[PDB]
């Protein structure tokens, strides 16, 4: 009956994205974004959601769920795959939200980016930034690139994540992934340890604290290729942001350094497609002879004009002329309506 391992069975069996456990109701499941209660077998759950949750939690997690009202952790079931779990107290009673963790890195062509992007993965050092709002394929793009390196280079890759989304098998290189909160205390002191761990590639899950970006740039300018993720929407947004989070006492020297070490920037958005509904739009900036200097001279508004690698709106039109994204979709995604409509 009420066995967590069997609840999971039925969830993937129905292609569920999430499962939810709360007292009053039977086990719930999110399918296509709709919550459905799998009455199938299990009946309305007693306060012994606590019993189910526990059958999955470590001892330092159960400790934690007491010290504070919630835990965020991952667990693996050999049968199927891996799962992210947030357990918490609801109405004096125990509640849980399990998520499915991706079991397979997509092929690069599957994504939507051009092959001009893959050229970044061959650069010897510098910063590769993939940005965009939560749910625009940032983690996917990175995983595709890190695994592309993994297939082709004899490197030592190190990733610092929150949480570990996709997982890597050893191939031509040797991959180590560290989860903040489980393997290490912080992005920062993990990235600091990373400098002494002989890595070829370093991947910061997120760069939200300044101290991290400060270590992230240090690494980049010291022989490493570093992958980083922001939440910005354009490329100019990105460069402006990481600069304008430093004290303006040598914020100009950030612009100098970034301009040497910034290797490429990809900003992503997932718009609805006409087939299966899933299409990626993007801004792409791989700096060259000219671009490099404009950033040093902080002439960023004039940078946009040289961009013919490809501006965000150009990606929108290209996706429209072929016939995938609609006009208003192409318009609501657009940073500036004025550049389009002209198309």
Q: Can you tell me which residue has the tokens 């791989």?
A: 286
Distance between CA atoms of residues 282 and 319, nearest Å: 10
Question: Is residue 159 at the binding interface for ligand ATP, with CB under 6 A as the rule?
Answer: no
The span of 88-96, 130-138, 248-256, 306-314 binding ligand ATP (CB under 6 A) equals 130-138
Using the minimum distance from each CB to its own copies, give the nearer residue, 300 or 307. 300
Strands 225-229 and 126-131: parallel
Using the minimum distance from each CB to its own copies, give the nearer residue, 76 or 114. 76
Nearest approach, Cβ of residue 177 and its own copies (Å):
5
Q: Pick the binder of ligand ATP from 136, 212, 234, 259 (CB under 6 A).
A: 136
The span of 39-47, 61-69, 137-145, 233-241 binding ligand ATP (CB under 6 A) equals 137-145
Q: Which of residues 268-287 bind ligand ATP (CB under 6 A)?
A: 270, 278, 280
Distance between CA atoms of residues 125 and 200, nearest Å: 9
Nearest approach, Cβ of residue 308 and its own copies (Å):
28
214 binds, among ligand ATP, its own copies, none (CB under 5 to 8 A by kind): none
Nearest approach, Cβ of residue 214 and ligand ATP (Å):
19
Q: Can you tell me which residue has the tokens 């609805």?
A: 272
183 binds, among its own copies, ligand ATP, none (CB under 5 to 8 A by kind): its own copies
Name which of 137, 135, 144 is nearest 117 in CA terms: 144
Using the minimum distance from each CB to ligand ATP, give the nearer residue, 279 or 331. 279
174 binds, among its own copies, ligand ATP, none (CB under 5 to 8 A by kind): its own copies
Name which of 230, 234, 232 is nearest 339 in CA terms: 234
Count other C-beta atoms under 10 Å from residue 204's C-beta.
25
Using the minimum distance from each CB to its own copies, give the nearer residue, 90 or 314. 90
- Kindly report each contact of residues 47-52 with a partner whose C-beta sits within 8 Å and lies 24 or more positions away, as own/partner: 47/23, 47/93, 47/94, 48/2, 49/21, 49/22, 49/23, 49/93, 49/94, 49/95, 49/96, 50/93, 50/94, 51/2, 52/2, 52/4, 52/7, 52/21, 52/96
267 CA to centre of own chain: 12
Using the minimum distance from each CB to ligand ATP, give the nearer residue, 134 or 154. 134
Nearest approach, Cβ of residue 206 and ligand ATP (Å):
8
The span of 21-29, 135-143, 148-156, 259-267 binding ligand ATP (CB under 6 A) equals 135-143
Token pair of 127 as six digits = 């910063």
Q: Which residues contact 7 (CB under 8 A, 6 or more apart)?
A: 19, 27, 38, 42, 52
114 binds, among its own copies, ligand ATP, none (CB under 5 to 8 A by kind): none
Nearest approach, Cβ of residue 193 and its own copies (Å):
5
Spell out the alpha helix ranges (H) of 27-160: 49-54, 59-67, 108-111, 138-152
Please check whether residue 215 is in contact with residue 222, taking contact to mean a CB–CB distance below 8 angstroms. no
197 binds, among its own copies, ligand ATP, none (CB under 5 to 8 A by kind): its own copies
Distance between CA atoms of residues 330 and 267, nearest Å: 15
314 binds, among ligand ATP, its own copies, none (CB under 5 to 8 A by kind): none
Distance between CA atoms of residues 105 and 87, nearest Å: 27
Interface residues with its own copies (CB under 8 A) are 18, 20, 22, 24-25, 28, 30, 34-37, 68-70, 72, 86, 88-92, 95, 97, 99, 133-135, 154-156, 164, 167, 169-170, 173-179, 182-185, 189-190, 193, 196-198, 200, 222-223
Q: Pick the binder of ligand ATP from 22, 139, 176, 298 (CB under 6 A).
A: 139
137 binds, among its own copies, ligand ATP, none (CB under 5 to 8 A by kind): ligand ATP
What is residue 87's three-state secondary structure? strand
């Amino acid at each position: 009956e009420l066995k967590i391992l069997e609840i999971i069975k039925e969830a993937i069996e129905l292609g569920a994205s999430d499962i939810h456990l709360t007292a009053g109701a039977p086990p719930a499941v999110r399918i296509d974004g709709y919550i459905k209660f799998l009455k199938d077998f299990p009946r309305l759950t007693p306060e012994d959601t606590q019993k189910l949750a526990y059958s999955v939690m470590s001892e330092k997690h159960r400790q934690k769920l007491e010290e504070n009202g919630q835990v965020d952790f991952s667990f693996g079931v050999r049968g199927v795959g891996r799962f992210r779990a947030n357990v918490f107290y609801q109405r004096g009673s125990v509640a849980a939200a399990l998520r499915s963790l991706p079991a397979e890195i997509p092929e690069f062509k599957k994504l939507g980016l051009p092959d001009k992007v893959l050229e970044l993965c061959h650069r010897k050092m510098g910063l590769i930034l993939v940005t965009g709002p939560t749910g625009s394929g940032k983690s996917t793009t990175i995983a595709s690139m890190i695994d592309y390196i993994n297939q082709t280079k004899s490197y030592h890759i190190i990733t610092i994540e929150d949480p570990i989304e996709y997982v890597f098998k050893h191939k031509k290189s040797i991959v180590n992934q560290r989860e903040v909160g489980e393997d290490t205390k912080s992005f920062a002191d993990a990235l600091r340890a990373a400098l002494r761990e002989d890595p070829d590639v370093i991947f910061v899950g997120e760069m939200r604290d300044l101290e991290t970006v400060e270590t992230a740039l240090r690494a980049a300018e010291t022989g490493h290729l570093v992958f980083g993720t922001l939440h910005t929407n354009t490329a100019i947004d990105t460069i402006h942001r990481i600069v304008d989070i430093f004290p303006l006492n040598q914020q100009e020297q950030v612009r100098i350094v970034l301009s040497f070490i910034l290797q490429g920037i990809i900003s992503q958005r997932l718009l609805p497609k006409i087939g299966g509904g899933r299409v990626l739009a993007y801004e792409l900036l791989i700096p060259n002879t000219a671009i490099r200097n404009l950033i040093r001279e902080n002439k960023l508004q004039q940078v946009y004009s040289l961009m013919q690698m490809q501006t965000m709106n150009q990606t929108l039109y290209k996706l429209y002329k072929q016939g995938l994204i609609t006009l208003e979709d192409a318009m609501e995604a657009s940073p500036d309506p004025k550049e389009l409509e002209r198309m």
